[PDB]
Amino acid sequence: FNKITPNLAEFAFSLYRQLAHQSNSTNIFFSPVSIATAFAMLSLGTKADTHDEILEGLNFNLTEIPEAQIHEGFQELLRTLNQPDSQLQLTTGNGLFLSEGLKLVDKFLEDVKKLYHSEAFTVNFGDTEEAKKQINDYVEKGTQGKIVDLVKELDRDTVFALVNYIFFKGKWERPFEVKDTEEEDFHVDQVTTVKVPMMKRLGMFNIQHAKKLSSWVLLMKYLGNATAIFFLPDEGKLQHLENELTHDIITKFLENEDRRSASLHLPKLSITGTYDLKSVLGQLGITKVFSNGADLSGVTEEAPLKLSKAVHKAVLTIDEKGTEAAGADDDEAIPR
Amino acid sequence: PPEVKFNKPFVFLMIEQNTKSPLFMGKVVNPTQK
């Protein structure tokens, strides 16, 4: 367990709750790790309370872990993520798109290269189409066609665009047989039932009851170093579940290896999440980096910059064979 | 053998085995919705 894992998990729940409160009755999907990676990278070039709001916003605590080790945590994290088991497919990458003539701070450039395996690119944001073409392509290649046109409109004054992505392609340890997939009712709300292709398999599963969540937890094992956890809340206990999630509670689960006999019904699915995180990140405490008081002098000492837009998009596909997922971050900086 | 059925809104997590980091998280409220 990576030293910085607990925090990443607490960021996930913190962020998830903001998102579920922003839109109450819609599908959600994002990549906590991806978002955390882009912003931890960003902080490197920030200072003062601009820098601290980001680290604290990511659920980090400087009294619990020294800053040097935090980045060092990400460094190993990205390294590990990019070293999956033969049977699993998983990649994550970081590209830093810097405008032409921008006088970067030597340290920042070297820090992002070493600690975040960031690739520096030079692009002219004045040639909007060209600028877009380059970013979306880098994203598309990283997400193997899963995430296209992450950027539809790019502002001409953009000074730099921090772009991050995660690609995932895992296979079920024990997959479903297509022939068992039949259409079933999905209960959306009191008066809304809908037919959806529902996969099913009879077998031994890791199924535990979490009273503290008033939910049942299902553990699906991927071939390799991946696992998916599904939470099925008791009647009327959805909000309670979202509210009660914590890292400790989860960690305790995976600690239980007891399997049981069951007939699992899991919905084949295809959901896409597209967000502007500027608002939800504000609720987390991250505001100054988006404001006229933002301090990005760590990235450049000539002009004062600021982040104007925090774009995140993630795509999830789940079927009989396993799961494919992609996540990508687009954080754009402009003169403050 | 009991039927465990994800036919109502539910939450989930995709975890990396080694680091234990949350690669993905989502909520399904309605499959036919993306």
Side-chain angles (χ1 to χ4, degrees), chain A residues 258-277 279:
Chain A
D258 275 6
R259 294 190 156 186
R260 75 180 306 180
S261 181
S263 178
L264 174 54
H265 292 229
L266 192 64
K268 185 172 178 187
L269 59 81
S270 164
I271 92 89
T272 299
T274 304
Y275 317 99
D276 173 44
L277 302 172
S279 195

PDB file of all heavy atoms in Angstrom, chain A residues 258-279, unseen atoms left out:
ATOM      1  N   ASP A 258     -12.908 -14.271   2.842  1.00  0.00           N
ATOM      2  CA  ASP A 258     -14.022 -15.217   2.824  1.00  0.00           C
ATOM      3  C   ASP A 258     -14.887 -15.072   1.576  1.00  0.00           C
ATOM      4  O   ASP A 258     -15.394 -13.989   1.280  1.00  0.00           O
ATOM      5  CB  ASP A 258     -14.886 -15.068   4.080  1.00  0.00           C
ATOM      6  CG  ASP A 258     -14.352 -15.866   5.254  1.00  0.00           C
ATOM      7  OD1 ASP A 258     -13.253 -16.451   5.129  1.00  0.00           O
ATOM      8  OD2 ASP A 258     -15.037 -15.912   6.302  1.00  0.00           O
ATOM      9  N   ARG A 259     -15.048 -16.174   0.849  1.00  0.00           N
ATOM     10  CA  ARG A 259     -15.919 -16.203  -0.318  1.00  0.00           C
ATOM     11  C   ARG A 259     -17.195 -16.976   0.002  1.00  0.00           C
ATOM     12  O   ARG A 259     -17.232 -17.759   0.950  1.00  0.00           O
ATOM     13  CB  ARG A 259     -15.197 -16.834  -1.513  1.00  0.00           C
ATOM     14  CG  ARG A 259     -14.021 -16.011  -2.026  1.00  0.00           C
ATOM     15  CD  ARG A 259     -13.487 -16.541  -3.350  1.00  0.00           C
ATOM     16  NE  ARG A 259     -12.789 -15.503  -4.107  1.00  0.00           N
ATOM     17  CZ  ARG A 259     -12.320 -15.660  -5.342  1.00  0.00           C
ATOM     18  NH1 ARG A 259     -12.466 -16.821  -5.970  1.00  0.00           N
ATOM     19  NH2 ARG A 259     -11.701 -14.656  -5.951  1.00  0.00           N
ATOM     20  N   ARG A 260     -18.242 -16.747  -0.783  1.00  0.00           N
ATOM     21  CA  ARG A 260     -19.501 -17.457  -0.584  1.00  0.00           C
ATOM     22  C   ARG A 260     -20.176 -17.781  -1.913  1.00  0.00           C
ATOM     23  O   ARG A 260     -19.827 -17.219  -2.950  1.00  0.00           O
ATOM     24  CB  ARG A 260     -20.444 -16.645   0.308  1.00  0.00           C
ATOM     25  CG  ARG A 260     -21.084 -15.449  -0.378  1.00  0.00           C
ATOM     26  CD  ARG A 260     -21.999 -14.692   0.575  1.00  0.00           C
ATOM     27  NE  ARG A 260     -23.004 -15.563   1.180  1.00  0.00           N
ATOM     28  CZ  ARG A 260     -23.923 -15.153   2.053  1.00  0.00           C
ATOM     29  NH1 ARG A 260     -23.967 -13.878   2.423  1.00  0.00           N
ATOM     30  NH2 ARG A 260     -24.796 -16.019   2.554  1.00  0.00           N
ATOM     31  N   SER A 261     -21.139 -18.695  -1.874  1.00  0.00           N
ATOM     32  CA  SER A 261     -21.886 -19.073  -3.067  1.00  0.00           C
ATOM     33  C   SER A 261     -23.008 -18.075  -3.347  1.00  0.00           C
ATOM     34  O   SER A 261     -23.774 -17.720  -2.449  1.00  0.00           O
ATOM     35  CB  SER A 261     -22.463 -20.483  -2.908  1.00  0.00           C
ATOM     36  OG  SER A 261     -23.172 -20.881  -4.066  1.00  0.00           O
ATOM     37  N   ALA A 262     -23.103 -17.624  -4.593  1.00  0.00           N
ATOM     38  CA  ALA A 262     -24.143 -16.675  -4.972  1.00  0.00           C
ATOM     39  C   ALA A 262     -24.372 -16.631  -6.479  1.00  0.00           C
ATOM     40  O   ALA A 262     -23.507 -17.016  -7.265  1.00  0.00           O
ATOM     41  CB  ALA A 262     -23.807 -15.285  -4.446  1.00  0.00           C
ATOM     42  N   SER A 263     -25.550 -16.161  -6.873  1.00  0.00           N
ATOM     43  CA  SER A 263     -25.859 -15.940  -8.277  1.00  0.00           C
ATOM     44  C   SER A 263     -25.802 -14.448  -8.564  1.00  0.00           C
ATOM     45  O   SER A 263     -26.746 -13.715  -8.274  1.00  0.00           O
ATOM     46  CB  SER A 263     -27.242 -16.489  -8.617  1.00  0.00           C
ATOM     47  OG  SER A 263     -27.559 -16.239  -9.972  1.00  0.00           O
ATOM     48  N   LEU A 264     -24.690 -14.000  -9.131  1.00  0.00           N
ATOM     49  CA  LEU A 264     -24.461 -12.574  -9.328  1.00  0.00           C
ATOM     50  C   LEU A 264     -25.128 -12.029 -10.581  1.00  0.00           C
ATOM     51  O   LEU A 264     -24.969 -12.574 -11.670  1.00  0.00           O
ATOM     52  CB  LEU A 264     -22.962 -12.272  -9.371  1.00  0.00           C
ATOM     53  CG  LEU A 264     -22.587 -10.833  -9.725  1.00  0.00           C
ATOM     54  CD1 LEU A 264     -23.284  -9.846  -8.797  1.00  0.00           C
ATOM     55  CD2 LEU A 264     -21.080 -10.656  -9.675  1.00  0.00           C
ATOM     56  N   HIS A 265     -25.875 -10.944 -10.409  1.00  0.00           N
ATOM     57  CA  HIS A 265     -26.439 -10.205 -11.527  1.00  0.00           C
ATOM     58  C   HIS A 265     -25.781  -8.832 -11.596  1.00  0.00           C
ATOM     59  O   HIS A 265     -26.001  -7.987 -10.728  1.00  0.00           O
ATOM     60  CB  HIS A 265     -27.953 -10.065 -11.367  1.00  0.00           C
ATOM     61  CG  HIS A 265     -28.693 -11.361 -11.486  1.00  0.00           C
ATOM     62  ND1 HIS A 265     -29.793 -11.518 -12.300  1.00  0.00           N
ATOM     63  CD2 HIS A 265     -28.481 -12.565 -10.903  1.00  0.00           C
ATOM     64  CE1 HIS A 265     -30.232 -12.761 -12.208  1.00  0.00           C
ATOM     65  NE2 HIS A 265     -29.453 -13.417 -11.368  1.00  0.00           N
ATOM     66  N   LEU A 266     -24.961  -8.620 -12.621  1.00  0.00           N
ATOM     67  CA  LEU A 266     -24.272  -7.347 -12.798  1.00  0.00           C
ATOM     68  C   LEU A 266     -24.572  -6.751 -14.170  1.00  0.00           C
ATOM     69  O   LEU A 266     -24.411  -7.417 -15.194  1.00  0.00           O
ATOM     70  CB  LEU A 266     -22.763  -7.515 -12.610  1.00  0.00           C
ATOM     71  CG  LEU A 266     -21.965  -6.214 -12.482  1.00  0.00           C
ATOM     72  CD1 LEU A 266     -22.372  -5.460 -11.222  1.00  0.00           C
ATOM     73  CD2 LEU A 266     -20.468  -6.489 -12.488  1.00  0.00           C
ATOM     74  N   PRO A 267     -25.005  -5.482 -14.194  1.00  0.00           N
ATOM     75  CA  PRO A 267     -25.412  -4.831 -15.430  1.00  0.00           C
ATOM     76  C   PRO A 267     -24.242  -4.527 -16.353  1.00  0.00           C
ATOM     77  O   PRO A 267     -23.310  -3.822 -15.968  1.00  0.00           O
ATOM     78  CB  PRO A 267     -26.026  -3.520 -14.940  1.00  0.00           C
ATOM     79  CG  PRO A 267     -25.302  -3.230 -13.678  1.00  0.00           C
ATOM     80  CD  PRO A 267     -25.089  -4.573 -13.039  1.00  0.00           C
ATOM     81  N   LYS A 268     -24.288  -5.066 -17.563  1.00  0.00           N
ATOM     82  CA  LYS A 268     -23.392  -4.597 -18.594  1.00  0.00           C
ATOM     83  C   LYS A 268     -23.601  -3.093 -18.606  1.00  0.00           C
ATOM     84  O   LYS A 268     -24.722  -2.627 -18.407  1.00  0.00           O
ATOM     85  CB  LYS A 268     -23.775  -5.201 -19.943  1.00  0.00           C
ATOM     86  CG  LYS A 268     -22.815  -4.862 -21.069  1.00  0.00           C
ATOM     87  CD  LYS A 268     -23.144  -5.653 -22.325  1.00  0.00           C
ATOM     88  CE  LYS A 268     -22.212  -5.282 -23.461  1.00  0.00           C
ATOM     89  NZ  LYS A 268     -22.628  -5.917 -24.736  1.00  0.00           N
ATOM     90  N   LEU A 269     -22.544  -2.320 -18.808  1.00  0.00           N
ATOM     91  CA  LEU A 269     -22.727  -0.874 -18.779  1.00  0.00           C
ATOM     92  C   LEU A 269     -21.695  -0.050 -19.541  1.00  0.00           C
ATOM     93  O   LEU A 269     -20.585  -0.498 -19.819  1.00  0.00           O
ATOM     94  CB  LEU A 269     -22.871  -0.373 -17.336  1.00  0.00           C
ATOM     95  CG  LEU A 269     -21.735  -0.627 -16.352  1.00  0.00           C
ATOM     96  CD1 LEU A 269     -20.646   0.412 -16.538  1.00  0.00           C
ATOM     97  CD2 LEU A 269     -22.268  -0.618 -14.926  1.00  0.00           C
ATOM     98  N   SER A 270     -22.099   1.167 -19.874  1.00  0.00           N
ATOM     99  CA  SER A 270     -21.277   2.093 -20.625  1.00  0.00           C
ATOM    100  C   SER A 270     -21.629   3.501 -20.174  1.00  0.00           C
ATOM    101  O   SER A 270     -22.622   4.066 -20.623  1.00  0.00           O
ATOM    102  CB  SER A 270     -21.551   1.935 -22.123  1.00  0.00           C
ATOM    103  OG  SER A 270     -21.055   3.039 -22.860  1.00  0.00           O
ATOM    104  N   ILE A 271     -20.830   4.061 -19.272  1.00  0.00           N
ATOM    105  CA  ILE A 271     -21.112   5.394 -18.749  1.00  0.00           C
ATOM    106  C   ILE A 271     -19.922   6.337 -18.917  1.00  0.00           C
ATOM    107  O   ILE A 271     -18.768   5.920 -18.828  1.00  0.00           O
ATOM    108  CB  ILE A 271     -21.566   5.353 -17.266  1.00  0.00           C
ATOM    109  CG1 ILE A 271     -20.376   5.505 -16.323  1.00  0.00           C
ATOM    110  CG2 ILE A 271     -22.357   4.089 -16.969  1.00  0.00           C
ATOM    111  CD1 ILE A 271     -20.071   6.944 -15.981  1.00  0.00           C
ATOM    112  N   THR A 272     -20.218   7.609 -19.170  1.00  0.00           N
ATOM    113  CA  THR A 272     -19.191   8.615 -19.421  1.00  0.00           C
ATOM    114  C   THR A 272     -19.389   9.817 -18.513  1.00  0.00           C
ATOM    115  O   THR A 272     -20.487  10.362 -18.427  1.00  0.00           O
ATOM    116  CB  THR A 272     -19.231   9.104 -20.886  1.00  0.00           C
ATOM    117  OG1 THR A 272     -18.977   8.005 -21.772  1.00  0.00           O
ATOM    118  CG2 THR A 272     -18.196  10.197 -21.119  1.00  0.00           C
ATOM    119  N   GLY A 273     -18.323  10.233 -17.840  1.00  0.00           N
ATOM    120  CA  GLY A 273     -18.378  11.403 -16.974  1.00  0.00           C
ATOM    121  C   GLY A 273     -17.541  12.551 -17.507  1.00  0.00           C
ATOM    122  O   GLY A 273     -16.353  12.388 -17.776  1.00  0.00           O
ATOM    123  N   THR A 274     -18.167  13.714 -17.658  1.00  0.00           N
ATOM    124  CA  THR A 274     -17.481  14.908 -18.143  1.00  0.00           C
ATOM    125  C   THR A 274     -17.786  16.090 -17.230  1.00  0.00           C
ATOM    126  O   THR A 274     -18.935  16.521 -17.130  1.00  0.00           O
ATOM    127  CB  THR A 274     -17.908  15.260 -19.584  1.00  0.00           C
ATOM    128  OG1 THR A 274     -17.670  14.140 -20.444  1.00  0.00           O
ATOM    129  CG2 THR A 274     -17.124  16.461 -20.093  1.00  0.00           C
ATOM    130  N   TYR A 275     -16.752  16.616 -16.577  1.00  0.00           N
ATOM    131  CA  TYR A 275     -16.939  17.647 -15.559  1.00  0.00           C
ATOM    132  C   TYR A 275     -16.017  18.854 -15.705  1.00  0.00           C
ATOM    133  O   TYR A 275     -14.968  18.787 -16.345  1.00  0.00           O
ATOM    134  CB  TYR A 275     -16.720  17.056 -14.167  1.00  0.00           C
ATOM    135  CG  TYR A 275     -17.345  15.703 -13.956  1.00  0.00           C
ATOM    136  CD1 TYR A 275     -16.585  14.545 -14.050  1.00  0.00           C
ATOM    137  CD2 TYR A 275     -18.692  15.579 -13.650  1.00  0.00           C
ATOM    138  CE1 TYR A 275     -17.151  13.307 -13.852  1.00  0.00           C
ATOM    139  CE2 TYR A 275     -19.267  14.343 -13.452  1.00  0.00           C
ATOM    140  CZ  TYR A 275     -18.494  13.211 -13.553  1.00  0.00           C
ATOM    141  OH  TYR A 275     -19.064  11.978 -13.353  1.00  0.00           O
ATOM    142  N   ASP A 276     -16.432  19.958 -15.092  1.00  0.00           N
ATOM    143  CA  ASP A 276     -15.560  21.098 -14.853  1.00  0.00           C
ATOM    144  C   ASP A 276     -15.339  21.174 -13.348  1.00  0.00           C
ATOM    145  O   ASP A 276     -16.241  21.556 -12.603  1.00  0.00           O
ATOM    146  CB  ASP A 276     -16.201  22.388 -15.362  1.00  0.00           C
ATOM    147  CG  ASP A 276     -15.399  23.619 -14.993  1.00  0.00           C
ATOM    148  OD1 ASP A 276     -14.156  23.583 -15.135  1.00  0.00           O
ATOM    149  OD2 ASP A 276     -16.011  24.617 -14.548  1.00  0.00           O
ATOM    150  N   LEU A 277     -14.143  20.798 -12.905  1.00  0.00           N
ATOM    151  CA  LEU A 277     -13.869  20.598 -11.481  1.00  0.00           C
ATOM    152  C   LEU A 277     -13.594  21.887 -10.704  1.00  0.00           C
ATOM    153  O   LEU A 277     -13.426  21.854  -9.485  1.00  0.00           O
ATOM    154  CB  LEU A 277     -12.714  19.609 -11.299  1.00  0.00           C
ATOM    155  CG  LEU A 277     -12.912  18.226 -11.928  1.00  0.00           C
ATOM    156  CD1 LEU A 277     -11.641  17.404 -11.848  1.00  0.00           C
ATOM    157  CD2 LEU A 277     -14.069  17.487 -11.269  1.00  0.00           C
ATOM    158  N   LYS A 278     -13.552  23.016 -11.405  1.00  0.00           N
ATOM    159  CA  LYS A 278     -13.251  24.298 -10.769  1.00  0.00           C
ATOM    160  C   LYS A 278     -14.185  24.581  -9.599  1.00  0.00           C
ATOM    161  O   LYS A 278     -13.778  25.172  -8.601  1.00  0.00           O
ATOM    162  CB  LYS A 278     -13.330  25.443 -11.786  1.00  0.00           C
ATOM    163  CG  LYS A 278     -13.165  26.833 -11.180  1.00  0.00           C
ATOM    164  N   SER A 279     -15.435  24.151  -9.727  1.00  0.00           N
ATOM    165  CA  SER A 279     -16.441  24.429  -8.712  1.00  0.00           C
ATOM    166  C   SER A 279     -16.337  23.463  -7.538  1.00  0.00           C
ATOM    167  O   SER A 279     -16.294  23.882  -6.378  1.00  0.00           O
ATOM    168  CB  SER A 279     -17.845  24.377  -9.319  1.00  0.00           C
ATOM    169  OG  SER A 279     -18.799  24.967  -8.450  1.00  0.00           O
TER     170      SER A 279
END
